[PDB]
Design a protein around this ligand. Structure first.
Ligand SMILES: [Mg+2]
Ligand SMILES: [Mg+2]
Ligand SMILES: [Mg+2]
Ligand SMILES: [Mg+2]
Ligand SMILES: [Mg+2]
Ligand SMILES: [Mg+2]
Ligand SMILES: [Mg+2]
Ligand SMILES: [Mg+2]
Ligand SMILES: [Mg+2]
Ligand SMILES: [Mg+2]
Ligand SMILES: [Mg+2]
Ligand SMILES: [Mg+2]
Ligand SMILES: [Mg+2]
Ligand SMILES: [Mg+2]
Ligand SMILES: [Mg+2]
Ligand SMILES: [Mg+2]
Ligand SMILES: [Mg+2]
Ligand SMILES: [Mg+2]
Ligand SMILES: [Mg+2]
Ligand SMILES: [Mg+2]
Ligand SMILES: [Mg+2]
Ligand SMILES: [Mg+2]
Ligand SMILES: [Mg+2]
Ligand SMILES: [Mg+2]
Ligand SMILES: [Mg+2]
Ligand SMILES: [Mg+2]
Ligand SMILES: [Mg+2]
Ligand SMILES: [Mg+2]
Ligand SMILES: [Mg+2]
Ligand SMILES: [Zn+2]
Lengths: 293, 159, 105, 202, 117
RNA sequence: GUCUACGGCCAUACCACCCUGAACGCGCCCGAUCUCGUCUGAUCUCGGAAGCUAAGCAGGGUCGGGCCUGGUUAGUACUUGGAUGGGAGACCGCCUGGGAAUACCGGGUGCUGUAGGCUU
RNA sequence: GUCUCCGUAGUGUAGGGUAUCACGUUCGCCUAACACGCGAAAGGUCCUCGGUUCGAAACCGGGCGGAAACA
RNA sequence: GCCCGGAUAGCUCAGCUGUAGAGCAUCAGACUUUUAAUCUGAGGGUCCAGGGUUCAAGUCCCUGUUCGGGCGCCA
RNA sequence: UUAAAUGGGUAAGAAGCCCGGCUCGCUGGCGUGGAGCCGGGCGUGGAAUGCGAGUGCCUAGUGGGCCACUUUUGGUAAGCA
RNA sequence: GCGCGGGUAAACGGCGGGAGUAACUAUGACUCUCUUAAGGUAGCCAAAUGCCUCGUCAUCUAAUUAGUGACGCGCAUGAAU
RNA sequence: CCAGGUGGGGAGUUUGACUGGGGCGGUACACCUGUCAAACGGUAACGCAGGUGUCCUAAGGCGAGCUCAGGGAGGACAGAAACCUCCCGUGGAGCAGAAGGGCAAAAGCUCGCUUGAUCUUGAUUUUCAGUACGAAUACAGACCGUGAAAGCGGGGCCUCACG
RNA sequence: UCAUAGCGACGUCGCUUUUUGAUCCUUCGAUGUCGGCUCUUCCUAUCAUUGUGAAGCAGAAUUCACCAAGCGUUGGAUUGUU
């Protein structure tokens, strides 16, 4: 009885609800319509999107195009699926982003029957490489990077996935600005610290430095590096072999697992009869407690 | 008397439907518009670009051109003395597909497959659509129930 | 309004976007040998008084501001003119206003 | 300064209320709408009588001023000052304009306020004791003569000013689907939360 | 005053510096915060007049300003409300109420609150 | 039966409070050398994996509030066309067809596309 | 009739952030005493009423008035 | 459109590339039988604004702001 | 918020539908897409009712209107506007 | 020639307003000021000149919006207009 | 003889329109919003409520980041209002102006960079007689800007701001 | 004292064309325009006179109503005046 209430009946009655995904805050519809909408005078040509997402544990990478029923996705990459060859520890980092981008590139190219042509960059390096179509061959695949809500700042892992793609053989337009090799004040691209971050010298030097400063903070930091005995060295060749295996076979297969039952883990919505019984027996219990006195 | 602005008398015309303000649903964007397909003109107000003039709202036309963000359509506009064919350009979100021609085409396709099936089976079949003919004299059962007797209820001045 | 003294823009001669110096256009003096002026002098000659209309109405308040712009490039100094909408108070290259100040002491 | 009411009898000018456009409106002569024992709760005044007019006329505010004063005077003289409650149901929202003494710019200045009624429209409303019906009938009868049209007087079947019928009202409040709240009542649907039920019925 | 002036100046402090400055102030108050300084959302804070006593000593240049602390609290996870992606509410029983502010106060600083006034 | 990424529709999905959450998962969480930012690693960015569902999230709960859909209001209000209908008018009745919206009382409360995981 | 302006210490006067001054009365100094002078005190709910905003004599709406100006 | 003349204590005007002055002023002091009257002081330049020549600008030069005038007039 | 009646637009086929096949310098992962084009098969003529239509040229007079049911603006009202 | 400067009203014309002030009150001889440069002096008046106006007072008659005499903040009298 | 001045002494000519008769008064004379307007559109009156002859090197063009009006709870001076923090907040603020529409990781605010307010041909819409002007919409061709990119931008979110 | 002998506030329903308005239908190839003088007739919403009713009608005088327009409704000063 002090202040007028805000969330009253009328406010709800005229409140408007945003889109489901906007309310969950998972899709910026402004930029989404900005990215995915194909021109009108093409009518069937899908504007492919390289969708990259940062997960506290994983890295999501997929190539999608939207239709009326929803988005159509041709192929996807998963950092949790990455260790099935090559690297086994150090996921959801920049090196992981580049590797999984290259993996997605290669598996798209294979499932397009196109992997042989447009090798991309077999040799990994931090400089600029943008693929070109070759005459007499099917046109080079192009797509754009669907950054999403992530703050696209120079040196963001999503750009690492983009570099993995462009080295893989995808023509994604991009300036040479948002990479570790770029210098802001000097407007220059070093292109060597960039490949250092791409391959992992950026965490390699840090974790090798961390030896002589500490050991137990070392333990609490790279605990899964201690297991697998992941040395600061011997961390170049295994990334190389990861890339080699990416080149060899990027195809992905599931695991046949059908032995499950219908053990419902939730509870269903009770029917009207249950609500009526509940309210009536609550009525009986209340009236009984009162007549008890 | 009144002015001749491009959007006079469109206060309630271009208002968003209640509980529908805000970002346009994206589905209406990637609808695929051919040439010669039939569309109607709505003119959503939240986009102020490519606006059709107030007259064309709520009329149906056929597309004669297609561009990056709009389509060229032909609509018959009634001038005072006669009706003229106008070619106008409107950004996509102001127009929708028209179900009239779609329903006609569905009926036509059913007619074509009916034509196919009636041929070899040898029986003569009906094609046109008739306008609700007379109603086929029939019986109504009683089951021994007495038709209840109505009687107007008496006038009372409630208020 | 305020407009910078120089600006990069498209120049027809060199066919790209070049830096240009702007200046408020000023109407030149009548030739007094051009055809129409000369016909006017011949007509006003002799008797008959004023043989042509005199506007003397002035329903407009201001003028369309015309900016004479020329490409700074040393080889080509072609001068094009662009027109700005009407304005009461015009100014060339004043200080750039900036929002975050005490307005005023 | 006030024209005859027969000039402004008919509602024919597209209801034109006081608004931001209608500025400089003379203050209405009606200010007091509910009279009598307004504190009376729900039962002490069971009978409800209404004046109802079957005509689409606009009624001048001063007319209902005179009518209300007359009804109050009869009530206080005859039924006593405590044993009735007076409520009118019209508000002169419509604004009437007059053009003063050619007719260039004939749109005149507002000078009064009138209220518009329809065929079934209560004007006066009285809740009082049951044995006061003969009193109230005469009270509304004398009140009618202050009104331009011809009106019907009707004893409301409902319990007083409540929107509910008088016959079922006592039981209705007994089984607690209804509660008294000041002059009026509060209908209680059985679709809230059980706490709102359980606070009462106990 | 007039708008767009430079009226106030502040900082936001978190971590070891935050708790040590808070304890510094509380010792300046000898840990007595009396009745209703706590805010119902859970947070609180107080003002003082003389900063020289503790901490840094007087310099004749600087003057005799007071100031006002307003320390805010929280449980691990509260940053979800400020997170850019998938922002959301925090839930009722995860929130903070005044009632437990004094409880944790006395649990940590043995300060005195709610005199019988 | 679910969950994750991308969604379509945009409250049956929203909001409030309560309870349950196995496995993956998503998170919360730790740290700031590098990338990057701020006043502050709070956000943003980067590097991790000691701990936790508490929060978010998902499911369910509420004689919940809404929202959706019904009956009701009601063949009422209103209205196409007709009368040498009534009435002083105000308006009303009739023929002809069409035909609503509160209140009040019921029911329901997210479906679904692609891609990818868990669940004896 | 319309329109414009204005309603304040006894009297007249100016004037959102607690009504100024002059005279009117009382008043106390000075003087031998008066006069004169000076000083203070008292003194107007700012025409009434409704609203507006933290608050209104002020701002906005009415009602009265008074005064012109048109008619 | 051209030629221009002036904007400075509350008011007007002189003026030093060199610390703005004179008055009409405002207020206060002496001065006085009081008032006049007499002086004295303090304070007061919407130095028309922006610049620039500049060591150095009220002045010198532009740019505008007005104020004023005297001239010219085919959209 | 909801929302009539009356009303405005469109469609109710042979210029349509379906099969092949070619061209493109636009588009493009792709035989893409799209458009254009050449052939081929389709007839129960794809609602009612009525009616013969289409098209070209010259051109007078007129450009003060008023009234009737109904809707409606100003006005007290008007054989008022 | 126009401007700038004198002179000129028996030249055309003009003769307003605000403050402050006297032992009832009132007015203001007096002091100051504004807008163009003065601010109606001597005189005369409801006049052939006064809307308000049938101004008011006296007289004239039974009765006078007429007449005369008188008063003058005179809408809007007035000195070779 | 030519030039400049003076020159109602004299000459020629003009001295708008709409208008509940005209005159005075207003502009219903070019425009824009809401209503009148009777649910496509069109629709008069000296019908009503209003507005315009501008303003903006950014108040334009991009991109990033934020959320506003208001309220609640607090915290020295500090209260009805100064400032900070937390909570609620469908927008109830702001977007130059009149009004209407539209707008929330927007079209609002703060920043980084910029001149797409540029150079060209046609088409269409708007009043329309389907003339013009103005304004506007889609393109197409250069040359650019911005962004990582998708794209977006050839002035102002749209409805007026002009020959 | 007493609502209504006589009056009637707040409201409300009308009648008249003797005011003044609003409109501009008739006449601008003209209907002579203010007032007065004279003269006739008509109207009643009756001032008097006939006959009536009512009163706060003792008489006198007066007021309010009904049938009622047959009859009568003046002489002068001032003003062009109504
Ligand atoms: Mg973005
Ligand atoms: Mg209109
Ligand atoms: Mg309008
Ligand atoms: Mg409308
Ligand atoms: Mg020429
Ligand atoms: Mg009358
Ligand atoms: Mg009307
Ligand atoms: Mg509910
Ligand atoms: Mg009907
Ligand atoms: Mg008419
Ligand atoms: Mg007419
Ligand atoms: Mg005199
Ligand atoms: Mg006189
Ligand atoms: Mg005379
Ligand atoms: Mg005589
Ligand atoms: Mg005389
Ligand atoms: Mg002449
Ligand atoms: Mg319409
Ligand atoms: Mg219509
Ligand atoms: Mg944005
Ligand atoms: Mg670009
Ligand atoms: Mg272009
Ligand atoms: Mg625009
Ligand atoms: Mg006439
Ligand atoms: Mg005539
Ligand atoms: Mg004739
Ligand atoms: Mg005659
Ligand atoms: Mg009679
Ligand atoms: Mg006789
Ligand atoms: Zn050039």
């Amino acid at each position: 009885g002090f202040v007028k209430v805000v969330k009253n009946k009328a406010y709800f009655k005229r409140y408007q609800v945003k889109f489901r995904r906007r309310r969950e805050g998972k899709t910026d519809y402004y930029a989404r319509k900005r990215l995915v909408i194909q021109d009108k005078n093409k009518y069937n040509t899908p504007k492919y999107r390289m969708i990259v997402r940062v997960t506290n544990r994983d890295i999501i990478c997929q190539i999608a195009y939207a239709r009326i029923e929803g988005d159509m996705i041709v192929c996807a990459a998963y950092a949790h699926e990455l260790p099935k060859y090559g690297v086994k520890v150090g996921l959801t980092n920049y090196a992981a982003a580049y590797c999984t981008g290259l993996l997605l590139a290669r598996r798209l190219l294979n499932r397009f029957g196109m992997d042989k042509i447009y090798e991309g960059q077999v040799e990994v390096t931090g400089d600029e490489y943008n693929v070109e179509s070759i005459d007499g061959q099917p046109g080079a695949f192009t797509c754009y990077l669907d950054a999403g809500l992530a703050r696209t700042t120079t040196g963001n892992k999503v750009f690492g996935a983009l570099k993995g793609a462009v080295d893989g053989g995808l023509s994604i337009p991009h300036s040479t600005k948002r990479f570790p090799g770029y210098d802001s004040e000097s407007k220059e691209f070093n292109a060597e610290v960039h490949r250092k971050h791409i391959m992992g010298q950026n965490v390699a030097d840090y974790m090798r430095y961390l030896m002589e400063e500490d050991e137990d903070a070392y333990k609490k930091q790279f605990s899964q590096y201690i297991k697998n005995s992941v040395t600061p060295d011997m961390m170049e060749e295994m990334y190389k072999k990861a890339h080699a295996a990416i080149r060899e076979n990027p195809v992905y297969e599931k695991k046949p697992k059908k032995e499950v039952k219908k053990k419902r883990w939730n509870r269903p919505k009770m029917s009207l009869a249950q609500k009526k019984d509940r309210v009536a027996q609550k009525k009986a219990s209340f009236l009984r407690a009162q007549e008890r006195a | 008397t009144n002015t001749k602005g491009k959007r006079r008398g469109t206060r309630y015309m271009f208002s968003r439907p209640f509980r529908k303000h805000g970002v346009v649903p994206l589905a209406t964007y990637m609808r695929i518009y051919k040439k010669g397909d039939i569309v109607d003109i709505k003119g959503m107000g939240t986009v102020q670009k490519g606006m059709p003039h107030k007259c064309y709202h709520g009329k149906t036309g056929r597309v004669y051109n297609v561009t990056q963000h709009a389509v060229g359509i032909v609509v018959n506009k009634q001038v005072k003395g006669k009706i003229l064919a106008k070619r106008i350009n409107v950004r996509i979100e102001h127009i929708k597909h028209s179900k009239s021609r779609d329903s006609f085409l569905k009926r036509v396709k059913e007619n074509d497959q009916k034509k196919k099936e009636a041929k070899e089976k040898g029986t003569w079949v009906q094609l046109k659509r008739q306008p609700a003919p007379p109603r086929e004299a029939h019986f109504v059962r009683t089951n021994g129930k007495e038709p209840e007797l109505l009687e107007p209820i008496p006038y009372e001045f409630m208020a | 309004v305020n407009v910078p003294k120089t600006r990069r823009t498209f120049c027809k001669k060199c066919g790209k976007h070049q830096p240009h110096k702007v200046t408020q256009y000023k109407k030149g003096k009548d030739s007094l040998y051009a055809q129409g002026k000369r016909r006017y002098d011949r007509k006003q000659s002799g008797y008959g008084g004023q043989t042509k209309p005199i506007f003397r109405k002035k329903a407009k308040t201001t003028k369309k501001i015309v900016l004479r712009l020329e490409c700074v490039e040393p080889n080509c100094r072609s001068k094009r003119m662009l027109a700005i909408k009407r304005c009461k108070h015009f100014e060339l290259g004043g200080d750039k206003k900036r929002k975050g100040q005490v307005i005023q002491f | 300064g006030r024209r005859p009411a027969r000039c402004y009898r008919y509602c024919k000018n597209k209801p034109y209320p006081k608004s931001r456009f209608c500025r400089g409106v003379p203050d209405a002569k009606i200010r007091i709408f509910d009279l009598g024992r307004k504190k009376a709760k729900v039962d002490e005044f069971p009978l409800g009588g209404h004046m109802v007019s079957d005509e689409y006329e606009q009624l001048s505010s001063e007319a209902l001023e005179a009518a209300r004063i007359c009804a109050n005077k009869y009530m206080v003289k005859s039924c006593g000052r405590d044993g009735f409650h007076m409520r009118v149901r019209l508000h002169p929202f419509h604004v009437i304009r007059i053009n003063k003494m050619g007719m260039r710019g004939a749109f005149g200045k507002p000078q009064g306020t009138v209220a518009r009624v329809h065929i079934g429209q209560v004007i006066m409303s009285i809740r009082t004791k049951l044995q006061n019906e003969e009193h109230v009938i005469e009270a509304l009868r004398r009140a009618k003569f202050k009104f331009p049209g011809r009106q019907k007087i009707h004893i409301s079947k409902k319990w007083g000013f409540t929107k509910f019928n008088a016959d079922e009202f006592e039981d209705m409040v007994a089984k607690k689907c209804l509660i008294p709240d000041g002059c009026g009542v509060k209908y209680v649907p059985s679709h809230g939360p059980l706490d709102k039920w359980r606070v009462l019925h106990s | 005053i007039r708008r767009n002036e430079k009226i106030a100046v502040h900082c936001t402090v978190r971590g070891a510096k935050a708790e040590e400055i808070l304890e510094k102030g509380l010792k300046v108050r000898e840990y007595e915060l009396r009745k209703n300084n706590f805010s119902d959302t859970g947070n609180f804070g107080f003002g003082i007049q003389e900063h020289i006593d503790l901490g840094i000593k007087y310099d004749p240049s600087i003057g005799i300003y007071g100031l006002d602390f307003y320390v805010v609290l929280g449980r691990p996870g509260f940053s979800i409300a400020d997170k850019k992606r998938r922002t959301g509410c925090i839930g009722a029983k995860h929130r903070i109420s005044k009632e437990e502010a004094m409880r944790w106060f006395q649990q940590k600083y043995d300060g005195i609150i709610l005199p019988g006034k």
